[PDB]
Design a protein around this ligand. Sequence first.
Ligand SMILES: Nc1ncnc2c1ncn2[C@@H]1O[C@H](COP(=O)(O)OP(=O)(O)O)[C@@H](O)[C@H]1O
Lengths: 512, 318, 517
Amino acid sequence: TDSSQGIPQLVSNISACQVIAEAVRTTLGPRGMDKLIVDGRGKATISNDGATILKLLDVVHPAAKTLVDIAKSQDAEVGDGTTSVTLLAAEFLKQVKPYVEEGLHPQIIIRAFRTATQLAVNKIKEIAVTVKKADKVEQRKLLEKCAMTALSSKLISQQKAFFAKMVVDAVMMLDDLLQLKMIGIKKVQGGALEDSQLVAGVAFKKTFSYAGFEMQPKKYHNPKIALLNVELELKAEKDNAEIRVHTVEDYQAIVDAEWNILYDKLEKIHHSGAKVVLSKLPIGDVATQYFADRDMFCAGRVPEEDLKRTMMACGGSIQTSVNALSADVLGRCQVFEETQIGGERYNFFTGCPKAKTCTFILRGGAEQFMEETERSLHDAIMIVRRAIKNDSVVAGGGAIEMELSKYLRDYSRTIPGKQQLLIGAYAKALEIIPRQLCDNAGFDATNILNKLRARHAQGGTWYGVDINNEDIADNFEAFVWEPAMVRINALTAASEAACLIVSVDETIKNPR
Amino acid sequence: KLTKDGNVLLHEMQIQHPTASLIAKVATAQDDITGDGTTSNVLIIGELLKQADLYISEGLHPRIITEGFEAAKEKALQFLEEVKVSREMDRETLIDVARTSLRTKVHAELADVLTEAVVDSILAIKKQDEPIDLFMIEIMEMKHKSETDTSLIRGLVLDHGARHPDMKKRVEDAYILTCNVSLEYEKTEVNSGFFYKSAEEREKLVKAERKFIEDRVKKIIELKRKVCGDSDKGFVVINQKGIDPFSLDALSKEGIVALRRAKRRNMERLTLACGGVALNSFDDLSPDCLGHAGLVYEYTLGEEKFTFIEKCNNPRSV
Amino acid sequence: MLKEGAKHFSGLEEAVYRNIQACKELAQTTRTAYGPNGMNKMVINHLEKLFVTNDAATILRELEVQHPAAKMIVMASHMQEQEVGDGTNFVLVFAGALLELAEELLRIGLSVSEVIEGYEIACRKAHEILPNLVCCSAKNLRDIDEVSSLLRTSIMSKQYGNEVFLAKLIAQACVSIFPDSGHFNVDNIRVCKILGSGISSSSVLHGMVFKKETEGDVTSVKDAKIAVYSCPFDGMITETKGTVLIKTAEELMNFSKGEENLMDAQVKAIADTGANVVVTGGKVADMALHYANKYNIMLVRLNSKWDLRRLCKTVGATALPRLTPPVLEEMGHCDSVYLSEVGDTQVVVFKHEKEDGAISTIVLRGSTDNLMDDIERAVDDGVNTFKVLTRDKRLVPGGGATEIELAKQITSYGETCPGLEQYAIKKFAEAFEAIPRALAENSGVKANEVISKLYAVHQEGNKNVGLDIEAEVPAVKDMLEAGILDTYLGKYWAIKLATNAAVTVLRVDQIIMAKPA
Ligand SMILES: Nc1ncnc2c1ncn2[C@@H]1O[C@H](COP(=O)(O)OP(=O)(O)O)[C@@H](O)[C@H]1O
């Protein structure tokens, strides 16, 4: 029944934002903690990504709603920088909180924040160094260094890095986007003799076998996948319907009357050229025999993702009819092979006219190695894509925030106005990345921040932080970098969010 | 709702005391005699009641108080009868009376443009020796953007007009005829208030109705051609039903205007001021029931054009 | 006790208390704005979208008050909004200041009639002395920068960041139709929203602009008569299910053939009657688009109630959502309908201008749907401000430079006539010092020093406090050469409405009872 306007409203907004800021904080580094989320249904899920946690949580607060909306928009427009922007906004709010209750009009800090952001953007633009085909003689040395930088992220085997480089370098033909959400990846289960295999085509996993399944040819010269939503199962067709039970001739009569239409339909759908039937429902017992007697192919039980991949690779068309079809909405392949390894029957579709997707089989013969060690390859291919597509780059880690903070602190000592303390607080609030990294890594940030400040007091290089050796080394030599375009956008989004939060002075409710 | 009157307030209030409600009802029941006398009455009654209560508390009987009150009332009546004086009624006295009434009712701003119109209407209505009647003066209202806007029309006012304007408006000596026949009610097929199943009967009824409408419009056209034949002698028809545009064009081609959607009070005032017989036929009869009109004007404002008829016989409608 | 039923607290003592406190509490939630500042307020009602606004119009249109003193001002606000373009918070601030200054006079011991008479005399004197501070005037309205400066000055009140491109676009859209001389309409300019790039890629285009795709053929003829309809592609034949799996193919094929023949006869009757194109407002079908492509008939896809409402209020047709093929009774005046490709989207263009009553539609584009509202508000405010119905606008140096001069003139005039009418004149003169105070308090500095500086320089009437930091403490700037002027008739109407509202409030002030059931 109590409400105010001005300082109490801003204090309440800051206190509400602090809750959602502290709710997600430990999930920032590469080895963050896991979180279990369970709704009212009864199924729980373990996740460690900040975006997945923010998407599965709703707040009944206007400031928190605007913050999570800005974070979702930034994650959808870019793809990196969701928790860092929230942490920066929370630190800015925590630094601006004591400079509000002392009788200060917040309309004078927006200009100072904008000038500081502009100066930081200008410094980042003038300090960024880009390199793309200008040295390292022929292009044969750039791919080697790219593969080395990709494998230096996670200490893995030598045979796994080469296969990853081959699978990431053989998919750069018609892809002109900035994300791997077009082709995608698919993890398989099982084991093989080798550790990893590569192929170009569609992949089909385990298929149920029956009696006489070897009657179909293993190799096809010019196969054509039959894109039909209907299936030929014992439940679809029928041999006895509503008929008068008298003698034994009525059964044969009705089964012949049905088989006439069945043969007409199958010959009409086979005369178009399609012969590789990919039925969604599993096959029965007599359907396989009927398909083998006509020297045709039969299948059953296939997921929707495999059908979509086949339609995208072979170039199939969506057919919404069973009969009265033509010979233009059908797919055309080239090589269809069936290779059984261990205890499964794998199927390969190689020779697609549209080189789009490729299969990267990773089977070592275990049940836990398939689920684990799956984020390292994703991070490696993401770093490779970011280094190939983007041109500008800079040293990653905590080597770019300390220099900006020192520059802002040195520049704030040349202004005779009220913006001195504002710029000082803005520069102090920028130190939140390496402290949080050291806190998540299980180290002592107090023993590293002092050394970083002492090294950056007169050096100004790319000396960041370490995790394995637990020391201070040059990030430019550790083969770890980051694009110089995501940080600018993240800082701009954080500044805009802070300005929008500090601009709101009160709220107005409406009962009816 | 803003108010300041005595009877209007006493009639629309929620009094929790039954005695006060009965007193207010008794006071309002005696307001239909004179003009406005419900105000400045409760104060004297309350003072007299307080004096009577004080005299009772002092020690007396209500009979002597009532006798003294009756004697004082008789003395006051005699004094008022002996102190009265006569004055010649003219224009300044009525002007001052209306000005004082407007000042006691409305603010001292627009109280100058209404008293003149009231005096003019009174002088135009009163001209005989019998007492006048407040039933021939119609007070209409409109919707405008300004505040001080008054008008004194010496004729009648018609809200509705015609669906096809822009033809003519300078009709001097016009003839008005009031009727109530079915000229064009609706194009939908009807019968006798009961739906049927066959369409031949209803289509034949519709064809017969159309033939009757054609015969009626031909009859009124020949009547207008017989009683006139030029452009100076105009004709105006008042009907409460609709009018088809295809027939309205043919009617206006010769010089006769037909109005649609007319209220009952409008035709009542028209037949009471002019004097016409309301029949249910469009036959060729005597032109004695046709009323005369001197000046007709069309005022275009808002979403509906108004009609002003004046310069008629016996101007007894302001 | 005798009249009320323990509902309202009215009597012979609430007049010099509640009737003023209600207006004070109503006006206190409004002084935070008024000026180029960033004080956005969120509005939560029924849309459930959480949008922030800055103007007080949308704030007052959503707040529900239950007091007659607060409802007596929204009527004057709506009247002022319907009359001229801007002008809303000025009347409220003036009424609040007048009530706060009359509270002291009522507490001292003076009747309300003398205060009303003094206020009326002061208002008459202000209205008489108002036509005397005319500096600049409108020269020729056929130029570009002459109206662009005024448009920029009007837009600077709302948006402070971007205001040149929008002003130039509004000037180009207004100069391409008709000027203020002769006849100029307001409901002939439409604003369309396009979800694509930012606001740095807008353009202008004359004629109708609608985001509607075309799955047929380009019909650039003049005989293509329009035919608007509600939902013609709804469902004239309702099909049900007999069994669970599937029914006999013969009945389904017969029903499909019958529906195809019916729709073919329908489109043939609608095309042979004198209508080449048809405006649909339902779903689509394979055979429908097939017939539309094989019959050379343009078929739309996007449907909206606003589009059909505008087409009905502009042309004058009527939709006929009937099953049987009707007759052609929607003949309009359009004939030249062309197609254009803007932003990889198909748009329609109508050409039917005969050098009279031309229309225009500016192309707007932004990031989200919560940012184009302020742009549209600024556009319509500038359009309403451009309309003045006079060749010479007679602009006056606004922003507070004229209020101090008017107050000084009223103070000098009141110190002449004797009697008990000087207190009301002094109060009306002192009430004019509420515009510079609210502008100085919403910046960052105080207002007493600003008022002292404005009163200590000179009585020129062209000095006002700026917006930058180098113009807050000194507040010595010449707004005549900068280009900051205001409407002459707008301030007059605002003062008149404020005086009328104050008179109405001070008049009706006694006992608020109730009505019987
Ligand atoms: N850029 C500016 N420079 C000086 N004064 C301004 C500026 N923008 C707005 N104002 C002043 O702010 C006042 C309020 O403007 P506005 O908000 O458009 O009207 P309202 O308050 O009636 O909605 C105006 O009287 C104007 O003088």
